[PDB]
Symmetry: D2
Subunit: 251 residues, 4 copies
């Protein structure tokens, strides 16, 4: 039988790219989404049209709350209900916005969203993935190559991505005896925010030593693909930067 | 006249050592506590006998909840009330226990481990900075074993990693205000009181420098260094005080 | 002549051999550099030339730091151009590894050997490779996942490996404008020293979370193959730990 | 009774400020120098005036060669000759200049940059440790080591190796009671050769005060690491960079 993978925030962008690429590699996929109903279903359609019964959608808010554990438990349940297995979990879903330290959302909403999506939901999804296990099991977390050179006023987001590095190492150590590898893919600049203007986009592009451009979503997916593959069978607790040398450029 | 410092979880162990050493260096201090009122008051009394009206206590739960921002705002407010200023914030308070991935509700554990170790320090940081010549700085109590974590301590580990991220981000963001932001990262200092004595010796014997844990005062020394005029260009730095423990391979 | 060409240093045995083999299996013509192991280097070349004619040469050079090291490194790179008309890939694999405690070989020889092979020779090879430059040009340095938790009394080895991390980062930055990518593979415990007793080998094996075993040479080679591939074309300045979680294990 | 310290490249700039501050703290100092003879003897005068018999100079070229071990051995020897002890070693001496991947031979470039920045520190560390209370070594590392300057590969390689040494020697020498630590400046006293527009360019990058570190600010970290207040600190590198290493492209 074909292996099965969960991709969080899979409706668009990097998540979609990962889902698609895992699909073309022969995975059945759970397209998790939050607000992107249209894009999620539309992607699952495209995928099923290619090989029938290979894609499902799973809606979940991944903001931290007392129900997040059940929501994460359910996401993994959705893989097992659809496919009888869960071989790969990609923690791709991410909230990303400034939270300036010196002063819309309450700060507790901000904490719930930025730490929730970026770290707490991956932790809970990992617990659920690991516990539901009865092959090549792995977890890939979408980290950030710029964690130690953070953007001004993104403290909560930065905190969550650091926590995610924390989890990747802690989970790799813990889940290694169960044969579950846990690794990271750290984009520098990939697909820029939809909201971002071209002039600003180019400001970021010009910083990238390797070709003065952002990563395509497929280039990110490539590293994900490598990590879940048999070519990475001994790789655990490793974070592969996919950043064109961005994190190496001094101020 | 004298600078003032907040130390969270300052009733016992490392926070106590930090509070004392700060006071010995001439700081007025807020001794924050959650459960340890008796110990907190005892410390304040001891320091006030040395210098009158130089130590105050302040109760707060630093677990993450909808009231944590108010609590943290109050911790900082209590320093400005007592002393008319807040020059130092030491984020020492920390919940610490294992949270296995394969098995208190996990969300309590989250609120406690991430709350104390990362969220409350972020909010305290905010309130500290909002309320602002001077030598303003923040010291965050990190963990030197963060990249070699203990088995089944994922949430603790995530919270400390988050604290490393806050150190860095706040150092950048607050540098234009002259607020320095730094970390001290113990390896093995005072062991958890609940831990078995043999389990303590195992940890002690692993330390390259003297096969013993750091005393609390040794941790406090790094903190004292970081808040001083001797560290006025230092921001975004985390100083390991671990006797080389983080350098020892499996 | 449309086939790409790779230089692998210390390619005669163990990890570099597996890398030469895997590169060859990928469609690379290979320069098999060696120092002492002439017989093994030639028999690799022969085995590879049996598979495809005129796709493997050998190149002898001592990689010890000396006045002639720069000429030697230039020759190694030239040899690839003379054999195959191109040089697409450099794999800095060769390494001396022995203790140099702080408290028949002189310390200066120890320096020349451990720093020469592990750092200087990679720097000069890098320089010659770049000076000489559809194309996908990259360098892969064989680092060490344990550089921040070093073995007792291996300071010079450790120092050369750390220097290699520096080169990887510095060369990635410098060579990104030429479209030369520069990455590391960092093994933990891989193919253990040839004579080392199985009781002692098991002490290292038991430390690894993922399977309580060392990496095969082929597993290290897998990460090298990924880094040189079309799948890694935005990856530069990255070091991929291939260590089975070994770096994550506390004392 | 008074402890003794070796500082390499102590005639000028950061080395000088380390020597000055160690002296003020109560150390006898060996002022190692290579070319800066006048400034070295001049510093030892200033120090010796202040407390006689507390400063010597020691000349050595710290470029890698077959004789570098004997020169490093000599530098430590000259501390024991003058003062009967050697409590502190400060690895400050550094070559620093571009070596692009694409006036000196590359073999000289290697010998200088890897010699001064890494090999001489290793050899000095060896000799220091061989001759053996609060014993320690401080290495002058670099906070920009993972965000290197363009075309400084050899220099960066040496500072990377220095981190390696700091860690490996900290581990190895800890059972002897010798601690080994690093101080990593970002932008401190900018190279003399550099023009003033370029200096200001670098100044503007520093989040904390938009200025370089004084040599005294760097020396303060060295002072802390050698002091009683750092007795459990080994294998730590303290960035003294005003938050520069935190600034993205
Ligand atoms: N793009 C880059 O340049 C870049 C750079 C560095 C790191 N990364 C990392 O790479 C990963 C993918 O990047 P990306 O730009 O493709 O991500 P993105 O488009 O900004 O967001 C990914 C998806 O996460 C889901 N999400 C957001 N908030 C959520 C919440 N509260 N609950 C549940 N789901 C939520 C969204 O799903 P719906 O659309 O269904 O609501 C969203 O489409 C992320 O983890 C990111 O942090 C990306
Ligand atoms: N001890 C070590 O070896 C070691 C190693 C690595 C890192 N560290 C770091 O060093 C720092 C201090 O260490 P320590 O051993 O002194 O830690 P500890 O005794 O375990 O710290 C607990 C202190 O923080 C307060 N605290 C705990 N949970 C809290 C909550 N939910 N809300 C509010 N306050 C809470 C406590 O206050 P009350 O008693 O008043 O309730 C207590 O005084 C910590 O940040 C720790 O992570 C220590
Ligand atoms: N194996 C592991 O467990 C492990 C762990 C961490 C890192 N690594 C890294 O992975 C790489 C390959 O590992 P390995 O175990 O296969 O390495 P290795 O067997 O120790 O050495 C590989 C080759 O390096 C060459 N070499 C040694 N000294 C030399 C000199 N002075 N001049 C020129 N060549 C010299 C030798 O060539 P000849 O035999 O032809 O003389 C040797 O066969 C190394 O860079 C190593 O540091 C390996
Ligand atoms: N300045 C900064 O902004 C900065 C930033 C990051 C790191 N650092 C590090 O901090 C330390 C001190 O900085 P600095 O600017 O004061 O250093 P520097 O002035 O550039 O050099 C210090 C001394 O090193 C000695 N030296 C150079 N080549 C030598 C050789 N071949 N043999 C023996 N000695 C040699 C010279 O001594 P003589 O004059 O006696 O010949 C020189 O005065 C260095 O390790 C440096 O890499 C400095
Ligand atoms: N303002 C602003 C700004 C600054 C830097 C970036 C870099 O691109 C990123 C970085 C992280 C990140 N995380 C997501 N979930 S999307 C994204 C884009 C994007 C936006
Ligand atoms: N099991 C286990 C175990 C392993 C290592 C340690 C080291 O000591 C620490 C570490 C973190 C920490 N955080 C606190 N709030 S107390 C404490 C003690 C303590 C317990
Ligand atoms: N003492 C000791 C000791 C430490 C680590 C290992 C793991 O195997 C390695 C590590 C690095 C290394 N470098 C080479 N050129 S071979 C090799 C084997 C083997 C022995
Ligand atoms: N080109 C160029 C250039 C870029 C940045 C700097 C920063 O200042 C430093 C850094 C390292 C260093 N090492 C020395 N031995 S002096 C020195 C000055 C100095 C020069």
């Amino acid at each position: 039988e074909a292996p099965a993978a969960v991709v969080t925030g899979a409706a668009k962008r990097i998540g979609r790219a990962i889902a698609v690429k895992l699909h073309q590699t022969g995975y059945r996929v759970v397209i998790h989404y939050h607000n992107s109903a249209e894009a999620a279903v539309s992607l699952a359609d495209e995928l099923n049209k290619e090989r029938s019964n290979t894609a499902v959608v799973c809606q979940a808010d991944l903001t931290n709350s007392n129900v997040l554990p059940a929501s994460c438990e359910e996401i993994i349940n959705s893989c097992f209900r659809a496919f009888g297995r869960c071989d790969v979990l990609v923690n791709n879903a991410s909230a990303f916005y400034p939270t300036p330290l010196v002063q819309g959302k309450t700060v507790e909403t901000q904490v719930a969203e930025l730490i929730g999506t970026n770290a707490i939901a991956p932790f809970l999804l990992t617990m659920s993935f690991a516990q539901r296990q009865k092959s090549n099991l792995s977890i890939v977390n979408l980290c950030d190559a710029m964690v130690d050179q953070p953007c001004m006023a993104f403290s909560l987001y930065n905190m969550g991505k650091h926590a995610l590095v924390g989890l990747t190492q802690s989970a790799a150590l813990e889940l290694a005896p169960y044969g579950i590898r846990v690794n990271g893919v750290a984009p520098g600049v990939s697909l820029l925010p939809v909201a971002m203007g071209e002039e600003e986009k180019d400001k970021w592009r010009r910083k990238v030593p390797l070709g003065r451009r952002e990563a395509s979503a497929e280039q990110i997916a490539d590293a994900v693909i490598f990590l879940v593959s048999g070519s990475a069978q001994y790789i655990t607790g490793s974070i592969i930067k996919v950043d064109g040398g961005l994190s190496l450029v001094h101020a």
